[PDB]
């Protein structure tokens, strides 16, 4: 794929000295960067990865599919309550296939409505057609024949066919109901468009196109005989069986009877209308020759064969062949060949191409194909997952996850991590490592985002990761919130300095109830003690107790000592003396500055104060 880096300013022209182009992939898929190391080339070109989906519709799609994946539970795996586990397994899986189909339809819709580019709509519909066909052929009957469940099958088939292409588009209905050079509606066109409708199961419309021109007119008048045919034929059409393969057995009976009766009877109509009515009855009766004759595309043939001839997939091999002999595969669209492949047994080798259309769809497709047991891990062996060692599906899912991580949409990160966590293969420790490396890139902003991260660190036991994340968060109010060892020590020192200099946080340490609950370390305790001391000071024996507490704190710990000395001087028995002594025993620029600020020599003043205290003790 060739895309223009910038369809505005292209930084090169002639081969004029092939310039050194440089490119760096960014942490965000949609924000990479290119530049050039050359003279007069100082522009920066932000480039986003070719064919990247940033849309909301896409993330919605992704979430929906992850939901289907998650909801599949144990059934997303395939075990190579006895004979029912099999049937019920297929039941739920087959249903999941329908869910995927739906989610993709919705997505495709929202793409057609909110869009700049409709190419995405077309590709997504194609993906849908191919998936409808896949379900119709492997996700309904579970290897059995149509009799096993005539209702569901014909429903999906009829659905698949009438969503693949648009024709017959009502823009073509009026196209012939307008064209003349003939009497009323009786040229190869009307009938071709009537048969087409029948072959596609579009019986309602079929009937309508008849009650449009000569149901009662030309027939009820000209030939009363063929009028009865053309009428109770429309009656049989009105009651084509779609639930009982018995009712169909009898239906084709009445139809073949009608075709024989009319077959040899009163010809009171034009030479052409005669046959034109016979063919219609043959097609309805299931004549192979005719079903092929009035078919525009192979899938019309195939569909017809299943609807009017013999409703057995045991003949699909033959049906497809005849169909392809009549109309070759139309290489205009990308869905026809894949459908042919599906029908003809070779399901595989579609994952790479679907991966080219859309990574996501391909991923989950491979996943459900593994669930069905249509593809499995043949490998049989290096302590990790993202390889060929596990499934092809595991591989594609894990790949999608990783791809989601660079998308920068925090909504999908749960999908990514969940995808990895639920991966049916790989050691819990291997996953542990992968998550340990991905999580740090989570684009958290809210509090909740962070709590989610943490919850995942808990759930997976990544204390070194959580410790790192938090470290990133820590990097006055912020510091208060934070309150590694060195940092705590520094915080302690700061608190002590503040106390020496001397609200809600301080009280909590010593809405409010919630905070107390959250709080429920050494630095913190020290600050609390300092606060208590200050409170006592604000409030003789109390003062002494506070002074004692201060001396004890000083012993546990230069600036602090100076502040203490200052406090003692301001205040200016045996225990007190002992404390003073210990302080003297314990006894740079910042300290001197603090001393100068307090005064607005220190050792001498301290000694003098000590002497005074001793004298006081002696007098007592």
């Amino acid at each position, epitope marked *: 794929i060739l895309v223009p880096m910038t369809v505005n300013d292209q930084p090169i022209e002639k081969n004029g000295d092939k310039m050194p182009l440089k490119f760096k992939l960014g942490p965000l898929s949609y924000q990479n960067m290119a530049f050039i190391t050359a003279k007069d080339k100082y522009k920066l070109y932000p480039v986003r990865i070719p064919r990247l989906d940033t849309s909301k519709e896409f993330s919605a799609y992704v979430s929906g599919l992850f939901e289907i994946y998650r909801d599949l539970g144990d059934d997303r795996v395939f075990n190579v309550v006895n004979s029912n586990f099999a049937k019920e397994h297929n039941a739920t899986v087959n249903l999941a296939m329908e869910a995927i189909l739906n989610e993709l339809e919705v997505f495709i819709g929202r793409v057609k409505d909110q869009d700049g580019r409709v190419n995405r709509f077309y590709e997504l519909e194609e993906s849908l057609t191919v998936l409808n066909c896949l379900r119709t052929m492997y996700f309904i009957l579970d290897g059995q024949d149509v009799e096993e469940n005539r209702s569901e099958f014909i429903e999906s088939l009829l659905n698949w066919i009438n969503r693949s292409d648009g024709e017959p588009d009502e823009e073509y209905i009026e196209q012939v109901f307008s064209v003349a050079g003939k009497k009323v509606f009786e040229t190869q066109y009307f009938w071709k468009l009537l048969n087409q409708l029948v072959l596609r199961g579009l019986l309602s419309q079929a009937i309508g196109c008849i009650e449009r021109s000569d149901l009662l007119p030309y027939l009820s008048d000209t030939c009363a005989v063929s009028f009865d045919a053309v009428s109770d034929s429309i009656e049989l059409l009105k009651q084509y069986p779609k639930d009982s393969s018995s009712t169909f057995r009898e239906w084709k009976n009445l139809v073949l009877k009608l075709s024989q009766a009319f077959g040899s009877s009163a010809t009171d109509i034009s030479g052409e209308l005669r046959d034109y009515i016979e063919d219609f009855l043959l097609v309805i009766g299931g004549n192979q020759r005719k079903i092929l004759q009035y078919s525009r595309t192979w899938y019309e043939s195939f569909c017809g064969f299943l609807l009017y001839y013999i409703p057995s997939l045991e003949l699909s091999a033959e049906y497809l062949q005849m169909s392809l002999e009549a109309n070759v595969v139309d290489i205009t669209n990308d869905w026809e060949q894949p459908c042919v492949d599906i029908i003809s047994g070779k399901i595989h080798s579609i994952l790479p191409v679907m991966e080219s259309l859309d990574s996501c769809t391909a991923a989950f497709t491979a996943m459900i194909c593994e669930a069905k047991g249509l593809i499995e891990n043949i490998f049989e062996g290096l302590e990790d997952l993202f390889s060929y060692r596990n499934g092809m599906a595991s591989y594609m899912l894990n790949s999608f996850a990783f791809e989601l991580c660079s998308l920068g949409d925090k909504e999908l990160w749960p999908v990514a991590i969940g995808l990895i966590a639920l991966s049916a293969t790989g050691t819990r420790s291997a996953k542990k490592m992968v998550i340990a490396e991905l999580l740090p890139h989570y684009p958290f902003v*809210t*509090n*909740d985002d962070i*709590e989610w991260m943490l919850s995942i660190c808990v759930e997976w036991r990544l204390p070194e990761i959580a410790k790192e994340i938090y470290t990133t968060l820590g990097n006055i*109010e912020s510091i208060a919130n934070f309150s590694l060892v060195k940092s705590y020590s520094w915080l302690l020192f700061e608190a002590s300095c503040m106390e020496g200099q001397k*609200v*809600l946080n301080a009280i909590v340490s010593k*809405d409010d*109830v*919630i905070i107390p*609950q*959250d709080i429920l370390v050494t630095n913190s305790m020290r600050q609390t003690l300092a606060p208590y001391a200050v409170l006592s000071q604000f409030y003789d024996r109390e003062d002494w107790g506070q002074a004692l507490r201060l001396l004890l704190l000083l012993i546990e710990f230069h600036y602090l000592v100076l502040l203490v000395a200052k406090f003692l001087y301001p205040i200016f028995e045996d225990s007190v003396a002992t404390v003073i002594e210990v302080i003297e025993t314990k006894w740079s620029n910042l300290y001197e500055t603090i001393i100068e600020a307090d005064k607005s020599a220190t050792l001498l003043k301290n000694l003098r104060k000590k002497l005074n205290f001793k004298l006081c003790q002696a007098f007592m």
Partner: antibody
Amino acid sequence: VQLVESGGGLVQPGGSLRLSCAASGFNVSYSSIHWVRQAPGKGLEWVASIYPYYGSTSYADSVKGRFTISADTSKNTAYLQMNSLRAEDTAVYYCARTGALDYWGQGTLVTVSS
Amino acid sequence: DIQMTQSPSSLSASVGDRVTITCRASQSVSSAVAWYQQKPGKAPKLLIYSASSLYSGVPSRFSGSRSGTDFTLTISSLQPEDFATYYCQQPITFGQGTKVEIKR
């Protein structure tokens, strides 16, 4: 991110109403939910709050004994049960949260009369 | 219960003017004071928390400050879209509100 408020309307005096506030986009479990009301042409009046963390609740004097605030963390939904309602209680009622009050309910009008 | 008194209760100012609204707490609350803007018929919107922290996304023309027990909300350059009632907040209690209009 969005608070949603339902269940007000018209109510006879002495009557009762349960207001819901369905939350999303944030941690209900560590947030506080507050109810603040505004009577026609008047200012804002805080009536009640609940801690989803501790379950602690409290009330303005004007509604105490008649209003009960509660919360179900498992559906991210909080409630205000309003009994013995009075003309004085007619107001638009807002739910709001704290982790100041950053996230506000679009409000629902409670009219109380006979 | 704590009372919060806003001054003035009402004001008129031209576009581009600097506007000051003050709020005085009955007792000494701590910087635990928030400012909100309410358009008529709509939920209040947070402007300022912790007295002086600008809530995320709010235009920088709005600022908060404290001097003791006086809290100040300032709008550095008044815009036509700025007409509203503004409330301070510290039971939780709200100030009585200041109505701001455009003069012509």
